[PDB]
């Protein structure tokens, strides 16, 4: 996370860290007691479930609790190196109890409307700068939803943003997700102060670059797919 701040325990209870052989590689989000949603690209090279573990809490160091992965489901239409349909599901080896420090986020219905200009938050243990290493303590950054048309302009992503994607950040840079944050959550609150998962950290041109906001997998566009695989 670039331009963010460290968080306190309990602020973002659904955040998870995915580790391969004990090393953090991607973020993920708890959507059920036994299910995590993440990005498909997190499992492109390292796909053996037995060597992946998930941890919760605000630190990777004294992890509050860890879980193994029983199964990994990548979207059928995802095709590396393309960024389209960048979504994955991971089933935990055992259920995670719901506590004030660790619990699921709500998923928006396919018709939920996130409006450009809406204030959202992205969290993760990712790099503080381009080519940097992951952090041990969870960070958050406030970003703004940018409409697809503006994000698709010639100076921006020039028509590369598909309907399965969403753009958020700042046109001037300053705040953005970065390497290591991939697969993590982009959330927003409704009037009842209930948090919903709007996006999944997917890609971008480097990190915090002007005119190149962060690109996220649009959850509403893949909501039914999640149901088809999990029943959630």
């Amino acid at each position: 996370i670039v331009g963010g701040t460290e968080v306190e325990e309990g602020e973002w209870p659904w955040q998870a860290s995915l580790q391969w052989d004990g090393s953090h590689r991607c973020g993920a989000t708890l959507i059920n007691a036994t299910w995590l949603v993440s990005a498909a690209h997190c499992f492109t090279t390292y796909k053996n479930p037995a060597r992946w573990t998930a941890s919760f809490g605000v630190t990777i160091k004294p992890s509050k609790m860890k879980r193994g992965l029983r199964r990994i489901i990548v979207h059928e239409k995802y095709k590396h190196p393309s960024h389209d349909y960048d979504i994955s599901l991971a089933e935990l080896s055992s259920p995670v109890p719901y506590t004030n420090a660790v619990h699921r986020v709500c998923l928006p219905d396919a018709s939920y409307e996130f409006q450009p200009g809406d204030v959202m938050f992205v969290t993760g243990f990712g790099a503080l700068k381009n080519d940097g290493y992951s952090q041990n303590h969870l960070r958050q950054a406030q970003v703004t939803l940018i409409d697809a048309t503006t994000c698709n302009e010639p100076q921006a992503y020039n028509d590369a943003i598909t309907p399965r994607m969403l753009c958020a950040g700042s046109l001037e840079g300053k705040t953005d997700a970065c390497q290591g944050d991939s697969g993590g959550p982009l959330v927003s609150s409704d009037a009842r102060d209930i948090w919903y998962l709007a996006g999944i950290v997917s890609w971008g041109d480097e990190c915090a670059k002007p005119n190149k906001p962060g690109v996220y997998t649009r959850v509403t566009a893949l909501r039914d797919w999640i149901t088809s695989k999990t029943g959630i």
Side-chain angles (χ1 to χ4, degrees), residues 26 30 66 106 143 148 157 176 183 217:
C26 275
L30 190 69
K66 283 193 179 183
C106 298
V143 292
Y157 290 108
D176 191 13
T217 300

Side-chain angles (χ1 to χ4, degrees), residues 17-203:
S17 159
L18 287 172
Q19 296 151 30
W20 172 262
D21 288 344
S23 292
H24 174 88
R25 286 197 170 259
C26 275
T29 303
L30 190 69
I31 57 173
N32 180 76
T34 63
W35 287 99
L36 294 178
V37 69
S38 186
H41 79 257
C42 289
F43 302 112
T44 299
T45 58
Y46 308 108
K47 51 187 182 177
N48 182 6
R51 298 219 291 177
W52 279 106
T53 58
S55 68
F56 307 86
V58 301
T59 56
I60 295 173
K61 221 187 203 66
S63 57
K64 296 203 71 182
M65 64 181 93
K66 283 193 179 183
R67 287 290 186 280
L69 295 194
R70 175 188 299 180
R71 171 171 144 230
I72 297 171
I73 301 170
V74 173
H75 193 105
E76 317 77 61
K77 294 187 177 181
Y78 172 79
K79 185 67 179 183
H80 185 73
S82 178
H83 298 117
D84 212 6
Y85 294 94
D86 197 5
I87 191 171
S88 65
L89 294 165
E91 184 179 15
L92 303 177
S93 56
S94 50
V96 295
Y98 61 103
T99 62
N100 56 163
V102 180
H103 65 83
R104 69 178 186 152
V105 216
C106 298
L107 288 177
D109 285 340
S111 64
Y112 198 111
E113 291 187 280
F114 294 108
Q115 304 295 340
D118 280 357
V119 169
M120 300 189 290
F121 292 81
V122 59
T123 53
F125 299 96
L128 297 177
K129 62 178 181 180
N130 298 306
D131 294 341
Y133 291 92
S134 65
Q135 300 296 293
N136 184 61
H137 197 111
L138 186 60
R139 304 182 73 87
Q140 70 170 52
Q142 177 185 305
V143 292
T144 306
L145 184 59
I146 300 166
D147 71 279
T149 305
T150 297
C151 199
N152 266 326
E153 292 185 7
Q155 354 69 245
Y157 290 108
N158 193 39
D159 295 311
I161 309 304
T162 72
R164 301 106 214 167
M165 297 171 198
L166 160 169
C167 296
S170 176
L171 286 304
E172 303 176 284
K174 67 199 83 291
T175 60
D176 191 13
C178 200
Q179 292 90 56
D181 291 314
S182 297
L186 173 71
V187 296
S188 68
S189 307
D190 71 352
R192 303 175 298 166
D193 294 323
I194 290 179
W195 295 92
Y196 290 86
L197 183 66
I200 296 161
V201 181
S202 185
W203 63 288

